[PDB]
Every structure is written in C-alpha cells, then in structure tokens.
Amino acid sequence: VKPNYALKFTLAGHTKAVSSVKFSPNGEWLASSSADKLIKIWGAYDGKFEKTISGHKLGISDVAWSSDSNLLVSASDDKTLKIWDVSSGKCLKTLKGHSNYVFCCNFNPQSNLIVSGSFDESVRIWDVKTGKCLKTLPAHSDPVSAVHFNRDGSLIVSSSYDGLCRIWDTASGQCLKTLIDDDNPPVSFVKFSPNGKYILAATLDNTLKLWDYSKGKCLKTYTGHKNEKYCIFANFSVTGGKWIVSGSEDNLVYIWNLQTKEIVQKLQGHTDVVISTACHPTENIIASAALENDKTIKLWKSDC
C-alpha cells in the first residue's frame, strides 16, 4: 500500500541546472538536459555516465526519446530543436521555425513526428525525416509549458501559462478540447496517462489535477507539495502500485497514492528545486533532477 523508494545513485556532471530527465523506452538509458547546453546519457540501472552530446548554442529545457531508443530530440533557448543519433552522437537535423525559446518536445509513438512547444506561444508539428515544420498551431496566448502525444499519436495535449490545457487532432491540427476548471492558474505541465484516457496537469498554485479527457472533467487532486514558480515534470508510476510522482520547490520528490490522493512518500536528498522526475518503463525506479544550487540527478528504487 506504500512504496519504499530509497536513494541508490547520485549522478553528477552537469555544470548548471538540470532541466529534464527521461528513461529510454527500452529501459537501458537515462538522458538528461541542462542549462549548460549539454545532453548527457547515463546507465538507467547503475547511473554510470555514458556520454555527452553537444551542439546547442544555448541552454536546453527538454529532451525526449524515439520509440526505438535510437534517437533523441532536444528543445533549446537557441530557438531550435535538434534530432540526435544517440549511438554516434551525430546531430541529424536542426528544426528551425520557432521565434523564441523552445521549452518542450516529444516524439509520437510512431516516431515519424515531433511536437514542440515554445515561449512564442505556438505548438509546432515536425517531420522527423526531413526536419521540416508540417503544422504551426496557434495554440495558446502565453508560453507553452508541455506537449505530449497520446498512445496512438492521434492526439496532442498542450499546456500553457495562459491557464489552459488543449487537446489537438494530430492529423487536422484542429483544437478538439479546451480544459477549464473553476479557476485558470498557469499550467506548468501536462501529459497523457499510459492508456491515453486521462490527463495529468500541474498548475502553479501547488496543485496536480487528474482529468478525464473524454468527459472533460477533473476527478482527482494531489496537493501537499510546493509548486508556484517552476515547470516541474510529473508522472504516472504504474510498474508496481499506482502512484503519482512529482518534483517540488521544497527540494523533495513527492509520491501520492493515485486513488486515495494521499502522500505515501517524500524523498529527501536534493538541495535545490526538483524540476524533473521520470519513471522507469518496467522497473520500480525513479529518476529526479534538480536546479542550479544542486545540479545532480538521483536514482531511487523501490520494491513496489
């Protein structure tokens, strides 16, 4: 009824704030991005440093894996995204078109497409093979904080400081739904559930909300943590028990029971804001990453 996550490894090497961490879909690797303009790769199970991937001209806010674990895409303050071959380190494409910082990115499950969100308030859809922008969505009226495809890639959910979550038809580019609560504080994060039926969104009033997408209604609420300033990544954890996992501006990793909404664990170790968390695809393993005063990534493991 409660996980028992404990610190196993601390990964040091970035020289500025870390911005995101993501496990490869094959579960072998962890990728990290940082304000230091670098991508680093680490062993997912032992935290062993693997390689540094370089090329962006300014800091990086987000990284994401292709479904076959062979490619990465990164989103940078230099207004570009880059597509990387992880094994060779080669930059395969530079995606140009956004007119301001690119803040978030993702492959679709098929991995023929990339979605990106920007401080220029647009969501763009890119062709992986050619690097060309296929669609530009007038998505929001403030910076876009997160973008994510659903399980079959037919849908995109986006979030923004404008207080909205919007769901988009990938093929047509049409806005299918706008999620509106009793209030609209800045939405700093959003992502689909594994089955794509639900949407987890974070707002800058210290609140995570779980939405039923089809019914367009908020069902569960998760609080107790601190989140008023930063775009902190959260997760469904489904390898053991069903949990919600999130970073927090009090330097802790928070873990909630998905159903009861109670806090079940709080992980201590970081010395600055935990900006990012990731859940391993098959094992009960959490990766967490922290901002400038800390700069380390931590790997935690649990029996459930």
Binding site: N195, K197, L210
Partner: peptide, 8 residues
Amino acid sequence: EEIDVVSV
C-alpha cells in the same frame, strides 16, 4: 471511482 490509467 477507482481509476485505471493502464488498460486500453
């Protein structure tokens, strides 16, 4: 009331 975020 018990949500299932995994089954498709």
